[PDB]
Amino acid sequence: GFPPGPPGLPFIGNIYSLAASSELPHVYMRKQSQVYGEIFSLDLGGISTVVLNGYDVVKECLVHQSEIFADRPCLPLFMKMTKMGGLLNSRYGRGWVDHRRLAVNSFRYFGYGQKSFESKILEETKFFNDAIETYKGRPFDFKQLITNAVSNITNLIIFGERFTYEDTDFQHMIELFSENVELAASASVFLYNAFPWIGILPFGKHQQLFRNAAVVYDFLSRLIEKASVNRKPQLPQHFVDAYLDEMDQGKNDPSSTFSKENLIFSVGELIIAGTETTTNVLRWAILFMALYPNIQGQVQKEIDLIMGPNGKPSWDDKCKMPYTEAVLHEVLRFCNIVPLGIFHATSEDAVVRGYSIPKGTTVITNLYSVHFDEKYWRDPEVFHPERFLDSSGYFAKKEALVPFSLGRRHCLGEHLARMEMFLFFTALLQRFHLHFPHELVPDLKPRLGMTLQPQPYLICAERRH
């Protein structure tokens, strides 16, 4: 029958278990998998859920049974936000196919498929490093600047332009949207999805989320209107124009899935997916480089050898920079920016390893448990970039590294994120030495959210050459 799992209280089930725990949810789930096995169940206030732990079960579900596990759960929060339309939380089906295909094609065509695109990223690193330089080595929080810089890469693809670092209205929208990604992980929202009548209560994190989402929605529709002003039909300049072309071609198809709503949802999703995740990867990398100056120095040694101290970083340099690549992958493995992926659901009744999983069951992919899977990793609890180097000193790709997930829903933005991570990291470490103020003791415990981000920390960036 159904997979077994820990017991919890009546009504609220394992929401109590997760909330009472001293461990963050993904850690709690990995430990429970040592007791009940690789696939176990949680009851989240009456919502029946299975958790997939370790490389093998995750791959068996997302890859071997790719169609069956490619759906999204109809949680009240998600139904309320996007009606299971758009792209990121779209039901597995025609609408998802339509939006996925459009987004994938737009990212190549308006983005990295064009010769001039990398130079637009480099211009962003220059805007970004110049802003860092203005602090003149005094301690500050990088979060805002990194967020601006990274969101701008996708802005180019979506809106056809970057926005300046004085655009406080755009930055405010992103701040509320990011708050929502964090609130989505709270006990308040787990309880809301279990007992949606809690919406009657006016105070709480659930009302903070709903209010933020209304503000963000309006802002996004106004950005999309402005980006469509000078549109030339069938000659799109960006994802918005391309979306509008699609709506025109499907005007007489009534089952066409493209819509004004779905444009706002899919745009919002593309914006927050990229901005939240890539930002946090860089924020974790900087923390660990300041923490471990010998590792920071090896990276800088390699930059100087390959790029030179004044040469412009290029994506083609990556294959000559194995240690830089090792460090970036080890930040992804170790820091787990998306620890529990995005929740899946079964699109039909499933059988996995003898256990029955009924249609619509929520499926949590514990990606953290894959990256700490001792069948595949030696001492996964240790941060060790050199685990990614082969006996000739070259970067070695590992099957059980899946920070972008696997299967049908695997990260659409992976290639772009990898370019951004590499070019921003190297441009930054080429120009500055990074360390903490007064060598101060920084906190490395992540915040609770749907992504893992560090607590606020100051860093001193000092010009090198």
Ligand SMILES: OC[C@H]1O[C@@H]2O[C@H]3[C@H](O)[C@@H](O)[C@@H](O[C@H]4[C@H](O)[C@@H](O)[C@@H](O[C@H]5[C@H](O)[C@@H](O)[C@@H](O[C@H]6[C@H](O)[C@@H](O)[C@@H](O[C@H]7[C@H](O)[C@@H](O)[C@@H](O[C@H]8[C@H](O)[C@@H](O)[C@@H](O[C@H]1[C@H](O)[C@H]2O)O[C@@H]8CO)O[C@@H]7CO)O[C@@H]6CO)O[C@@H]5CO)O[C@@H]4CO)O[C@@H]3CO
């Ligand atoms: O006003 C009397 C009120 O009585 C009943 O409510 C009780 C409730 O059921 C209990 O749970 C408890 O409430 C405590 C609550 O659980 C705590 O979370 C807390 O609140 C903090 C929040 O955590 C934090 O988010 C923030 O609160 C902000 C809200 O999130 C935000 O939405 C906004 O709230 C405003 C609302 O937009 C607006 O509705 C208006 O509120 C009126 C209500 O519409 C109306 O129902 C009635 O409230 C009754 C209610 O019916 C009973 O269930 O009158 C309200 C007029 O005041 O205005 C809101 C105020 O801004 O802004 C807030 C900013 O605070 O911060 C708080 C910090 O405390 O503490 C609660 C302790 O009370 O008890 C209450 C009654 O005591």
Ligand code: HEM
């Ligand atoms: C370090 C950077 C990033 C990481 C680690 C990351 C990770 C992930 C993960 C784990 C998923 C879950 C897929 C699943 O459901 O199993 C995902 C989905 C997704 N990501 Fe990313 N991501 C990154 C950057 C980006 C960027 C920059 C964009 C867009 C500009 C993006 C767009 C998306 C979209 C649209 C989905 C949902 C796709 C679908 O449902 O079909 N991601 N990502």
Ligand SMILES: C=C1CC[C@H](O)C/C1=C/C=C1\CCC[C@]2(C)[C@@H]([C@H](C)/C=C/[C@H](C)C(C)C)CC[C@@H]12
């Ligand atoms: C799609 C939108 C934009 C317009 C409106 O505000 C409604 C809306 C909400 C989006 C949300 C709110 C809930 C939490 C969502 C679903 C996030 C979910 C939990 C996914 C998070 C993963 C980890 C991403 C960030 C990589 C992404 C989009 C967020």
